[PDB]
């Protein structure tokens, strides 16, 4: 019926009157702030904190927890639902972390959703403006489809490296930031395939199939030492804090930043390709989004923990060193691609300047934070020793 059948307490005369009659004449407490007891990272409490902090039911025996008692149900053997034992790192309070961007689900999907639709329009303009006409056939069929297409699995692998962390993180603020770091990675991977799928639609004869890129990844040479580092950070690491740290503050900051930015984002232009750099723009904005959180977690919080500063800083340097090597190995194996580029596309003087940029940045954004002594020269020379 036009009026319907269900009567509603807010609008139904009889029911609403009963509700109104039962109402007090003033709120039974003037304190209307849902996260009032939470200690602000900034001047005022943000919606981000009120909605996130302490949603995890940890007891006090887990740094920061506010509940009490053992869990109600545990793993066969007795393993706690969550516990201190799942990470080498120790802290005064696991709830100290704060995403500099204050990203909860809402803002998070709002931004990626805008990007998705911005992306869709971009592709329709690009195709209608016929920009594909100025793109180098070789670069397209060989470097974007094969090598770039194969890097899809690199990002994809770094994504899955977040599965355990999504299950073991010791706090809500760390769990959300972490899940977003992983989601952004799968995003990029799917974006590399999106481009390949696009090209297929406007470039007859272009196969979107992963077949080619996959084989270059699984049984290739360019990304051999690379895949080994990924299969390691993902399946061989069991400490959630080691995966997040190692991946975002070691592997991906060196190998990843060099490949995405110092190779494609830098060479794609010279081949009349404004398409790929469009997606690499996203992956780089994302990288910088994550980095702020990854720094706030492992440095501001852990590395600078008022009681375990020394401890963590040591364990991290330990990881920094444990992975800096597999990283370096994955970078030199990448060099074998520079001899694939048409003769006269890039001299080593550049590679040295770009290879030094990935390292230098890494040093100012990570290594120097945990007081890890890194030698720019030895690093650069090491990966170079595999070049051409």
Partner 1 sequence: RAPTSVNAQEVHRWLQSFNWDFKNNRTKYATKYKMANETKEQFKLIAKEYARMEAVKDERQFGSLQDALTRLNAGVRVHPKWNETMKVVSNFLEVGEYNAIAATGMLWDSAQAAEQKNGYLAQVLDEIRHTHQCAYVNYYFAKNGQDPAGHNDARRTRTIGPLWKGMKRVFSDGFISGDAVECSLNLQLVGEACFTNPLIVAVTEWAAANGDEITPTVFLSIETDELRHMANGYQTVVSIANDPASAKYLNTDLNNAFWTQQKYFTPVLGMLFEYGSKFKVEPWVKTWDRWVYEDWGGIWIGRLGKYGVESPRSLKDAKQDAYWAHHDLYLLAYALWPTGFFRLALPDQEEMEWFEANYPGWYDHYGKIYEEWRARGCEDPSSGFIPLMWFIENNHPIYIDRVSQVPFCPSLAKGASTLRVHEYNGEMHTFSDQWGERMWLAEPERYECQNIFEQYEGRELSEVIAELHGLRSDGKTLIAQPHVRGDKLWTLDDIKRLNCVFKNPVKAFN
Partner 2 sequence: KLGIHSNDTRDAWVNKIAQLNTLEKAAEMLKQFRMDHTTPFRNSYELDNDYLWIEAKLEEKVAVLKARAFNEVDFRHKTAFGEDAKSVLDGTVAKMNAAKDKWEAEKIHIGFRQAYKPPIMPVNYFLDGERQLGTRLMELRNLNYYDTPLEELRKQRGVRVVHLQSPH
Cα 47 to Cα 35, 98, 102: the distances in Å are 9, 12, 8
Count Cβ neighbours within 10 Å for each residue of 22-52 and write b for 16 or more, e otherwise: eeeeeeeeeeeeebeebeebeeebbebbbbb
- Under the binding rule (CB under 8 A), the answer on residue 84 touching partner 2 is yes
Stretch of 63-71, 124-132, 148-156, 240-248 contacting a second copy, by CB under 8 A? 124-132
Dist. CA 96–CA 303, nearest whole Å = 12
Q: Please, which of residues 46-75 interact with partner 2 by CB under 8 A?
A: 59-63, 68-70, 75
Q: Which residue, chain included where needed, has tokens 């360019």?
A: 222
**Interacting partner of 210 out of a second copy, Ca ion, partner 1, none (Cβ under 5 to 8 A depending on kind):** partner 1
Q: How far is the CB of 360 from partner 2 (least distance, A)?
A: 25
Stretch of 32-40, 43-51, 205-213, 266-274 contacting a second copy, by CB under 8 A? 266-274
* Residue 306 near residue 92 (C-beta atoms within 8 A): yes
* Residue 177 near residue 293 (C-beta atoms within 8 A): yes
Q: How far is the CB of 126 from partner 1 (least distance, A)?
A: 8
Tokens standing for residue 193: 């395939």
Q: Which residue, chain included where needed, has tokens 């895949």?
A: 227
Q: How far is the CB of 263 from partner 1 (least distance, A)?
A: 20
- Of the residues 13, 24, 27, 77, which one makes contact with partner 2 according to CB under 8 A: 77
Stretch of 201-209, 263-271, 332-340, 371-379 contacting partner 1, by CB under 8 A? 201-209
Stretch of 44-52, 270-278, 317-325, 345-353 contacting partner 2, by CB under 8 A? 317-325
Stretch of 48-56, 108-116, 177-185, 218-226 contacting a second copy, by CB under 8 A? 108-116
DSSP three-state, residue 23: coil
- Of the residues 78, 125, 306, 344, which one makes contact with a second copy according to CB under 8 A: 125
**Interacting partner of 266 out of partner 1, partner 2, a second copy, none (Cβ under 5 to 8 A depending on kind):** a second copy
- Under the binding rule (CB under 8 A), the answer on residue 162 touching a second copy is no
- Alpha-helical segments (H) within the chain: 13-21, 47-52, 105-128, 137-138, 149-150, 152-160, 163-168, 172-202, 211-218, 224-235, 240-246, 257-259, 265-267, 276-295, 309-335, 348-365, 376-384
Cα 29 to Cα 24, 25, 32, 50, 172: the distances in Å are 11, 12, 7, 18, 28
Q: Please, which of residues 210-249 interact with a second copy by CB under 8 A?
A: none
Would you tell me the crossing angle of helices 376-384 and 309-335 to the nearest 10 degrees? 30
Q: Please, which of residues 219-238 interact with Ca ion by CB under 5 A?
A: 221
- Of the residues 87, 140, 158, 184, which one makes contact with partner 1 according to CB under 8 A: 184
**HSE of 321 in the Cβ direction (CA atoms, 13 Å)?**
11
Report CA torsion sign: 202, 206, 209, 210: negative
Q: Please, which of residues 230-269 interact with partner 1 by CB under 8 A?
A: 231, 235-236, 238
Report CA torsion sign: 313, 234, 56, 30: positive
Stretch of 33-41, 211-219, 231-239, 294-302 contacting partner 2, by CB under 8 A? 231-239
- Of the residues 5, 6, 11, 205, which one makes contact with a second copy according to CB under 8 A: 11
* Residue 293 near residue 101 (C-beta atoms within 8 A): yes
Q: Which residue, chain included where needed, has tokens 């972490």?
A: 178
Binding characters for Ca ion, 78-117, by CB under 5 A (x = yes): ----------------------------------------
Residues in touch with Ca ion (CB under 5 A): 221, 347, 349
Residues in touch with a second copy (CB under 8 A): 1-3, 10-14, 16-17, 20, 23-27, 111, 114-115, 117-118, 121-122, 124-126, 128-131, 133-134, 261, 265-266, 268-270, 272-274, 277-278, 281, 284-289, 291, 357, 361
């Amino acid at each position: 019926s036009m009026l319907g059948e269900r009567r509603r307490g807010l609008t139904d005369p009889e029911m609403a009157a009963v509700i109104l009659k039962a109402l007090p004449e003033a709120p039974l407490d003037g304190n209307n702030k849902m996260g009032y007891f939470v200690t602000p990272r900034w001047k005022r409490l943000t919606e981000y904190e009120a909605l996130t902090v302490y949603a995890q039911p940890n007891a006090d025996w887990i740094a920061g927890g506010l509940d009490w008692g053992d869990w109600t149900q545990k793993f066969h053997g007795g393993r706690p639902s969550w516990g201190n034992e799942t990470t080498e790192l120790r802290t005064v309070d696991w709830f100290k972390h704060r995403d500099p961007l204050r990203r909860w689900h809402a803002p998070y999907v709002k931004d990626k959703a805008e990007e998705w639709r911005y992306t869709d329009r971009f592709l329709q303009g690009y195709s209608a403006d016929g920009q594909i006409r100025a793109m180098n056939p070789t670069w397209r069929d060989e470097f974007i489809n094969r090598y770039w297409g194969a890097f899809l699995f690199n990002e994809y692998g770094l994504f899955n490296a977040h599965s355990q962390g999504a299950r073991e993180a010791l706090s809500d603020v760390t769990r959300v930031s972490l899940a977003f770091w992983g989601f952004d990675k799968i995003d990029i991977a799917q974006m590399i395939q999106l481009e390949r799928g696009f090209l297929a639609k406007i470039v007859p004869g272009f196969d979107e199939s992963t077949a080619v890129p996959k084989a270059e990844w699984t049984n290739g040479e360019v990304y051999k030492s690379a895949r080994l580092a990924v299969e390691g950070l993902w399946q061989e690491v069991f400490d959630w804090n080691e995966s997040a740290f190692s991946v975002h503050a070691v592997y991906d900051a060196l190998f990843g930043q060099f490949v995405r930015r110092e190779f494609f984002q830098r060479l794609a232009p010279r081949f009349g390709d404004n398409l790929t750099p469009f997606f690499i723009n996203q992956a780089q904005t994302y990288f910088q989004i994550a980095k702020q959180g990854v720094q706030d977690l492992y440095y501001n919080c852990l590395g600078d923990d008022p009681e375990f500063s020394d401890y963590n800083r040591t364990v991290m340097r330990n990881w920094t060193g444990k992975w800096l090597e597999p990283t370096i190995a994955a970078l030199r194996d990448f060099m074998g691609l520079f001899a694939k580029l048409p003769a006269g596309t890039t001299d080593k003087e550049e590679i040295t300047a770009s290879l030094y940029r990935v390292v230098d940045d890494w040093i100012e954004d990570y290594a120097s934070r945990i007081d890890f002594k890194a030698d720019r020269d030895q690093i650069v020379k090491a990966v170079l020793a595999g070049l051409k």
